[PDB]
Amino acid sequence: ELFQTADWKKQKHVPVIEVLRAEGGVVEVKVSVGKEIPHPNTTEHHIAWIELVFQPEGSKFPYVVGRAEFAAHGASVDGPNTSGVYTDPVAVFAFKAEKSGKLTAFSYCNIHGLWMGEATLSL
Amino acid sequence: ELFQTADWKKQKHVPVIEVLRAEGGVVEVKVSVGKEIPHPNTTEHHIAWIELVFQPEGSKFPYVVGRAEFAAHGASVDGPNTSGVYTDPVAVFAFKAEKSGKLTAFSYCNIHGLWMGEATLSL
Amino acid sequence: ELFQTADWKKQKHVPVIEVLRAEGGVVEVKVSVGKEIPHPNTTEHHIAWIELVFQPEGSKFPYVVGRAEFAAHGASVDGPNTSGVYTDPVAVFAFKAEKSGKLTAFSYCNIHGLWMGEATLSL
Amino acid sequence: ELFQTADWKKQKHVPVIEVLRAEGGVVEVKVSVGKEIPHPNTTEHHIAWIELVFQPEGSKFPYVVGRAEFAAHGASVDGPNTSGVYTDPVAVFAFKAEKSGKLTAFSYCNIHGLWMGEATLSL
Ligand SMILES: [Fe+2]
Ligand SMILES: [Fe+2]
Ligand SMILES: [Fe+2]
Ligand SMILES: [Fe+2]
């Protein structure tokens, strides 16, 4: 499987989903990589993006809610790891949802392949 | 000019930059379109993405911090605006910075073209 | 499983991979959805993107080659399907490969979910 | 202005736009970085994406045609520039247009900032 899954307590690359809030029709879901025990952010090694998917209970198909790209990793004309701008693999998605469902998160490490995390959304 | 810019309290499409935190190298910036006056989110008309660019003081070139795509706008097999899943154009960027610098936000409406906002990052 | 890998009856969603070039490692890969039987492209219903993944023979992890986003679906200030601009779901990924390996392409329809198709690239 | 522009014969960062087809409403646009003078593709220094924008002449607003991400730059578990997979900054955008218009392409280098090129689309 292209999408690797691991315990997030013991494994660095699993994208972790946290349902923070559910206000006025609007859910806010936090997704992060390297939550308890941190992942590197270097020119050579970094998390590039996270994509969040939501499949509502009555739906035949899942929907992509969004995608967060982490594009800065210290590269500059003065050489790798010199720009001082490093983007964290952490994202917050605000979306309107009416019913409950399964949230799926995908993440990509530039040297460690593709990863997946899951959680349930109760409305 | 392709990137339209106006007052954000006065115009729905201007992406608004809010520095939530900026202490000790640990920065968090909130970006949103339609802060004062909400922008619609239907399948036919919606904000599609936000891109954050950051240029540190000593740098000749700007760096892209990140990009947030907002992909769900209610489309489903039951017709447009039927899914109950709508992504709000608000994004949160967490990144490390070593110097202060200038922030630039870009946004896209599928029917109203491209937009821009600016702010300063103080550490 | 989220990624559907088998196409339906009269409806073509499976992303098709065609190798246009493979000369000494200088590769060109075309990916298309609904190549022969066109897939609809309207403001309400359209393919949003294709992502191509490549995993070399000696590699433990796969690498993402690229992603092509198709952003125009006819929406304009005059209403859905009025702008006359529609981006076709076809992409060309140009990359170097030094080894043979596995190609995996992913695509997303806004109302019909996520899809996966595969091919092997031989040098 | 963030988007730098130069002659593309004398500067390898300028995205070069080439109209491959424009027959009866069927447009094909090739955009590429480093047509004349190749740009390096290393883990440390590389072109990340190209975005195509088009404003049909009778339109108040420009439309984003598409966006191409070039994600592989040779990085692997054995260190930078070790994968043998390097994605070339070249993209092909296939789209429907009903009128002629103006094309604008934007591109990004991770250390050299943002770039812009223009061309006219006659149908
Ligand atoms: Fe990693
Ligand atoms: Fe708008
Ligand atoms: Fe579809
Ligand atoms: Fe460069």
**Superfamily of A1-123 according to CATH:** SOR catalytic domain (2.60.40.730)
**Spatial contact of C95 and C27, defined as CB atoms under 8 Å apart:** yes
End-to-end alpha-carbon separation of chain D, Å?
A: 31
Calpha distance A67→C48 (Å, rounded): 13
Residue B42: DSSP 8-state: B
The helix/strand/coil state of C66 is strand
d(CA A122, CA A113): 30
Residues around ligand 2, an ion, CB closer than 5 A: B 109, 112
CA B48 to chain centre: 10
Residue A122 CB coordination number (10 Å): 8
Residues in chain A: 123
The vertex-D45 CA angle with D83 and D113, nearest 5°, equals 145
d(CA A54, CA A96): 11
- Distance from the Cα of A111 to chain D's closest Cα (Å) equals 5
Q: Residue D108 in 3-state DSSP?
A: strand
Q: How far is the CA of B81 from the centre of ligand 2 (A)?
A: 16
Experimental method: X-ray
Instruction: Determine the distance separating the centroid of ligand 1 and the alpha carbon of A91, expressed in angstroms.
Output: 18
Over its C-alpha atoms, chain A yields an Rg (Å, rounded) of 16
Q: Is C120 helix (H, G, I), strand (E, B) or coil?
A: strand
Tokens, residue B120: 């300063």
Alpha-carbon gap: B32 to the closest alpha carbon of chain D (Å): 20
* CB atoms closer than 10 angstroms to residue A120: 10
With a CB cutoff of 8 Å and minimum separation 6, the contacts of A23 are none
Whose tokens are 């952010």? That residue is A41
Which of A113, A13, A45 minimizes the C-alpha distance to C56? A113
Which of B61, B108, B113 comes nearest D112 by C-beta?
Answer: B61
CA distance C113 to B32: 27
Distances (CA, A) of D96 to A73, D26, D55: 37, 5, 13
Stated resolution in angstroms: 2.6
Q: Which of A104, A75, A110, A60 is nearest to A89 (CA)?
A: A110
Nearest CA in chain B to C83: B111
The answer to whether the CB of B97 falls within 8 A of the CB of B58 is: no
From the list B121, B117, B91, B96, the residue with the least C-alpha distance to B25 is B96
- Neighbouring-strand partners of residue C15: C33
> B62, B17 in Cβ contact below 8 A?
no
Neighbours of D37 (CB within 10 A): 12
Question: Cβ of D26: how many Cβ atoms within 10 Å?
Answer: 13
Query: Among candidates D34, D19, D32, D35, which has minimal Cα distance to D95?
Result: D19
Answer yes or no: do A110 and D75 touch at CB < 8 A. Answer: yes
A85 with B63: Cβ contact below 8 A? yes
CB contact under 8 A, B75 and C44: yes
Phi-psi region of B36 (alpha: psi -120 to 50; beta: other; left: phi over 0): alpha
Place of tokens 């292209």: A2
